[PDB]
Symmetry: D2
């Protein structure tokens, strides 16, 4: 029957665009969310109106804790319960905010949220995906600017660097099971809702190819390629989708 995919943080923005394009391609989808319950249920409604019984939501907090392994097992189990299989995992959910080294959240909360969502949750989701196991693959949303990082984002950048490590280590370890593991690395795509217009335009003007941010759909297009049969020899690769931003010197 139709393959099934889990997309984390799929209620809004890039994860929503990935869930939509997978669904358009033929997948049944689990729409994971944390706080955005109305947007999650609304997307599932839209996808199920298009093909009945092809979308479910699954709520979970991907902050690191001693129950995060159970939450990640539950996300994968939700896909098997709804659809009887789980072919694709997209690790899209992410906390993103500054953590300056020199001075409402305590530092161990910042560690738990930024390292948990960007790295530890992907690892545990990978573990659960592999253990429960056509064209199986995992796509991790990485960051094209990981080696040219934003000032005062050390914990975020540590998380994204750890996600590169996971993409490589899991590609190596899961290749014998036919599971491919790859990444998509945006530069500037949909800018943070909290950011003012002048700051957004500052970022847009840095991008060589068009002086504009990527659409969510342009990031989703690279995800679709990597899960497709046109990528069946590709594993351990991270595709930058940044309009050349990472090539630009200071």
């Amino acid at each position: 029957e139709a393959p099934a995919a889990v997309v984390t943080g799929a209620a809004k923005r890039i994860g929503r665009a990935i869930a939509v394009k997978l669904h358009q391609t033929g997948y049944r989808v689990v729409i994971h969310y944390h706080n955005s319950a109305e947007a999650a249920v609304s997307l599932a409604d839209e996808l199920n109106k298009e093909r009945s019984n092809t979308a479910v939501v699954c709520q979970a907090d991907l902050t690191n804790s001693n129950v995060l392994p159970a939450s990640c097992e539950e996300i994968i189990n939700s896909c098997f319960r709804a659809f009887g299989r789980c072919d694709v995992l997209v690790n899209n959910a992410s906390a993103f905010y500054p953590t300056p080294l020199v001075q409402g959240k305590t530092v161990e909360t910042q560690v738990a949220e930024l390292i948990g969502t960007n790295a530890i949750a992907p690892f545990l989701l990978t573990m659960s995906f592999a253990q429960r196991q056509s064209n199986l693959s995992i796509v991790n949303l990485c960051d094209a600017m990981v080696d040219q990082p934003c000032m005062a984002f050390s914990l975020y950048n540590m998380g994204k660097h750890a996600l590169v490590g996971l993409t490589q280590s899991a590609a190596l370890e899961l290749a014998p099971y036919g599971i491919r593991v790859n990444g998509v690395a945006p530069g500037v795509s949909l800018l943070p809702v909290a950011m003012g217009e002048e700051e957004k335009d500052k970022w847009r003007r840095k991008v060589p190819l068009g002086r504009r941010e990527a659409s969510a759909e342009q990031i989703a297009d690279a995800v679709i390629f990597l899960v497709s049969g046109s990528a069946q020899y590709i594993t351990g690769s991270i595709i930058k989708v940044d309009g050349g931003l990472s090539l630009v010197h200071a």
Copy 2:
């Protein structure tokens, strides 16, 4: 009406698969060749039987010399003459052989072939392509996923492939204002050299994590087709490995 692509070294192996798959996607194609005239014409005959007047051949030596710039200008010119436009350049042609540092062809001939075909010809072709320019214009360079874990005694070849990464990044930056994207595809082990013995071929296949086999030429071509497509319109300066995980494997 139909876009047009140039593929260098297109008579055989990976460049032939790239030309076939572009043609199948609806491109008109220039099949460039150096020594493989019969094979080049055989492919053009096959593509033209499918759709008339959609494939031409172009002979050129891509060794570095005083005449390489004129030759590269002629390859690009052939596409404009045949088809009225040139939307895609695939730099696929490549010399590959060892050049030991501690001791046939003189060393400066080895330089001209390994650095000329793998790096200088792509640079000159890129200059000609850009100078002659809605549209979806892009260049794809055939790179090598093992550029940082090179084969023993292949220094000039490795130098040429590293220079091609530099051209990919430099040209992506400089041509972005013209809407020209520049990207790479980096195979690991794909079609093994004809000269290689069967036992040595098997030793390499056994190293690959994903299925213990080499990439087909069509699996390499699939990544080229993605990068020239509308699904890659924000991608420039990216090199996609297509290596089955081989570059992740420690010694």
Copy 3:
């Protein structure tokens, strides 16, 4: 006055050689340890015999937990209480063991130990070091891994922690450059091998190394640390020096 350095995991092997060479260079040293108290104290006593009042020990578990930030603050504070200054931090301590993705510690313990020692503790130590600073040559050296992009099979959590440490090295280099604090790494390939590893297995690794078919001594790793903290490296920040005999260049 003599400058002062904190070296984590300094009782044995590479951290011990780093602490010895820094002391030989004229630093006073805090020898941090977790379980190896006898070896830590034996080194501090040897160092104090060479020059009185130039070495102290500091015990702490660097596993991630709610108390890790306090522990890491106390390690930096110990250097200021002993010596009145803290010029150099070497993030050397590390947990290292396989964590297979597929079928007696729980996975959250594995996460706490591998990501805590290799990445979170270095970040918290870096925060505490910088906060206490806000003639001088201040720097941090992180012990990285030359094989981070060609990792050992079934070491995903170890490899994630060492990739996070590359990120820390780069992010902290950029953010601390205004304060004159340089942040660099040294990335061994194969150095001192596990103690009870059979010679026949040690030889399998040694034979992979192009330069000399042998592992690095601890002292060879320490030499790169000494260069990075020296006045000969005063424009170097954000750099990771491989000390791996060419091992990372070797294809499968």
Copy 4:
């Protein structure tokens, strides 16, 4: 006896600072130069006054040509003829100027100068150095910290510095069995070009996180001195950035 080193492009700037610091460490030096004869001889005179018979000059044009191999052979031979040994090779000489892809030297001259000096001459010197061996032998290549974030319109220069990364890695691998280590030093901004106005210099200076200033020549030479030293005896195939953080700064 004292060891001996060749430094290419050593009459001025960074290559002079490297030759001076090697000479202060106890090396005998060959000061290679191309056009800077007055400056080369003046430096050798200063070093000879300090310790007699410890410095010679050697003239050569490192542009690629069919005689570049003989010129490279002769630079290494100059060191054996003056001092009876050659322990260290520093590949410092470099051409640097823009080569825009979209438009008085011909393009083939630009290729010969920018790829010859930055990549092929280091390769041929590496071959000559290795073949003349019968101690702590090493080669240091002057690379560029900004090779992955290149200056607009410098594609040939960037190609040559990428190829020099490939040579560094390939030669470290291949020469390790002979005990020759091969490493790189990668400046960001150091001594700015003499042609550059102060306003333009300050634009570059302000980009550098560590001190908002360029590296001194002596700071670059310090990293060379470390890599040839006994404190780097297990280091091969490493490129050390000396860039004050510049390569970490986003656009």
